[PDB]
Amino acid sequence: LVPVYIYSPEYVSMCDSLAKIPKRASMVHSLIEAYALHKQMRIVKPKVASMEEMATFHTDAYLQHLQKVSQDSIEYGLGYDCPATEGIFDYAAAIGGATITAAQCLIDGMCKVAINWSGGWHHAKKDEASGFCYLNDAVLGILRLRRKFERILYVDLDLHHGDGVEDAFSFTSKVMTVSLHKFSPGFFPGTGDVSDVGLGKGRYYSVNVPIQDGIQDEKYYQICESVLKEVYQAFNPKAVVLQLGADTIAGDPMCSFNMTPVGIGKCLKYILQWQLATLILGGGGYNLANTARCWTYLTGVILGKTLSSEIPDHEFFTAYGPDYVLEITPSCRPDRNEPHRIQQILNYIKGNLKHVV
Ligand SMILES: CN(C)c1ccc(C(=O)NCCCCCCC(=O)NO)cc1
Ligand SMILES: [Co+2]
Ligand SMILES: [K+]
Ligand SMILES: [K+]
């Protein structure tokens, strides 16, 4: 009954070493902990991913290059996007096996909810590092759930289209990928439009909710709930893998959406309320301070608690200036989202979302 928390001082400090999000893992942990939230969670040391466990989704031709590069890489996407910095491999198996580990504690009755905030890398392709993802811990996790479950539902709430995971299963009807993400021309990865729904026996079992800048907790919880509404029926999932990137939270430098940990919390509540096994992953999130606030607050809903509004003093207490409160206030900017356009989509989806069984 006690949610699993994938921790380990080794792990956390292993993640801290990721260039793009320095010490993010720590700030997240320390804050979640300085809230005594781990006192109500089944902490579990995460295992390192085996070369054969990663070989479950990634080609060996690729897994190979990753290993012999963490001492013509430009062929695996190892450039400015995903630099081949020494050790990124030892790091990959870390986050990967860390998600697989949480997958297990889910199919072991060990809990109805496993959490691993350091995971979420969804852009990673079968044989190609993409958008800061060198391994696709999400796919690796979904593939571990496929052992005890027959229909896994992946829900990507990160600001970017969860493509890597989507393609990983676009040809299957056993895993349905839903993704709410800003869609616009020139904005990464650029894929994932409402039209996009997969192929093969997996046609339609791929959902996409292209949103514009500004969307706040209101219009968001509606779109998310309604879209999940249809999906909980048409698909009737067994397990759930939810990606919760916090780069959709007013504050992030990505400066696109304009949510707060609350809107995303409603969605989380609505999904938790199906009581199916749920694997929680984090992902993007560029306002280190804010990111920790958002996930801690989310850890707080998963635990059903109501966290203190004032930010407890902890190692990084300094970085929550200049208000030192757990809440985020929406930016004072517009909502380029047409109420009418949202409708066309919500329907086009409702439409496609039916030919399912
Ligand atoms: C200010 N600065 C130095 C930069 C700003 C933006 C990017 C970028 O978006 N690059 C393209 C790849 C973006 C990947 C985002 C990964 C993500 O959040 N996935 O969910 C790079 C550098
Ligand atoms: Co993102
Ligand atoms: K997304
Ligand atoms: K699919």
Q: Which atom of ligand 1 is nearest to the CA of 159?
A: 20
Cβ–Cβ < 8 Å for 198, 206: yes
- Residue 322 preceded by cis peptide, ω within 30: yes
- From 118, 132, 166, 291, give the residue whose CB has the most ligand 1 atoms within 8 Å, as the site to mutate: 132
How much is the CA Rg of the chain, to the nearest whole Å? 19
Which residues does 229 contact at the CB level (< 8 Å), separation at least 6?
none
Q: What is the DSSP letter of 133?
A: B
Alpha-carbon torsion angle 200, 204, 206, 210, nearest 10? 130
Amino acid at residue number 238: K
Q: Which ligand is nearest to the CA of 166?
A: 4
| Beta pairing class for 239-243 and 113-116 | unpaired
Cβ–Cβ < 8 Å for 179, 166: yes
Write out the two tokens for 262: 């609350």
- Nearest of 207, 218, 172 to residue 350 by alpha carbon: 207
Q: How many residues can be counted in the chain? A: 357
Ligand 2 center to 109 CA (angstroms)? 31
Ligand 3 center to 133 CA (angstroms)? 14
CA distance 343 to 181: 16
Q: 3-class DSSP state for residue 93?
A: helix
Q: Distances from the Cα of 42 to the Cαs of 60, 240, 280, in angstroms?
A: 34, 19, 14
CA distance 239 to 102: 13
β-partners of residue 180 are 209
CATH of the domain at 151: 3.40.800.20
CA distance 290 to 294: 6
Cβ–Cβ < 8 Å for 45, 7: yes
CA distance 147 to 284: 28
Write out the two tokens for 313: 């003093």
Q: Which atom of ligand 1 is nearest to the CA of 120?
A: 20
Which residues does 283 contact at the CB level (< 8 Å), separation at least 6?
119, 120, 121, 122, 158, 243, 244, 245, 246, 247
Number of domain units in the chain: 1
Strands, sheet with 4-5, edge to edge from the N-terminal-most edge strand? 42-43, 4-5, 113-116, 277-281, 239-243, 152-156, 175-182, 206-211
**CA dihedral for 229, 235, 239, 242, sign (positive or negative):** negative
Ligand 4 center to 350 CA (angstroms)? 16
Write out the two tokens for 159: 């600001």
Could you please report the per-residue DSSP string of 227-265? HHHHHHHHT--SEEEEE--STTBBTBTT----B-HHHHH
Phi, psi of 111, deg, nearest 5: 170, 165
Write out the two tokens for 201: 């026996």
28-62 core/surface letters (b: 16 or more CB in 10 A; e: else): bbbbbbbbebbeebbebebbbbeeebbeebbeeeb
**Ligand 1 site, CB within 6 A:** 81, 123, 131-132, 158, 160, 188, 245, 247, 283-284
Which protein residues have their CB within 5 A of the ion that is ligand 4?
A: 169, 198, 202, 205-206
Q: Distances from the Cα of 145 to the Cαs of 63, 107, 108, in angstroms?
A: 22, 7, 11
355 labeled part of a ligand binding site: no
- Going through the chain in order, the beta strands assigned E by DSSP cover 4-5, 42-43, 113-116, 152-156, 175-182, 206-211, 239-243, 277-281
Determination method here?
Answer: X-ray
- From 188, 243, 287, give the residue whose CB has the most ligand 1 atoms within 8 Å, as the site to mutate: 188
Name the strand (E) or helix (H) holding 219.
Answer: helix 217-234
Which residues does 60 contact at the CB level (< 8 Å), separation at least 6?
none
β-partners of residue 9 are none
Ligand 4 center to 199 CA (angstroms)? 8
Centroid of chain to Cα 255: 18
Q: Given 29, 58, 123, 181, which residue is catalytic?
A: 123
Centroid of chain to Cα 348: 25
213 labeled part of a ligand binding site: no
β-partners of residue 87 are none
Which protein residues have their CB within 5 A of the ion that is ligand 3?
A: 156, 158, 162, 179, 181
Breaks (C-N over 2.5 A) in the chain follow: 71
CA distance 286 to 160: 13
Range of the domain at 142: 1-357
Q: Distances from the Cα of 124 to the Cαs of 8, 140, 149, 171, 215, in angstroms?
A: 24, 11, 23, 17, 27
**Is 123 among the catalytic positions?**
yes
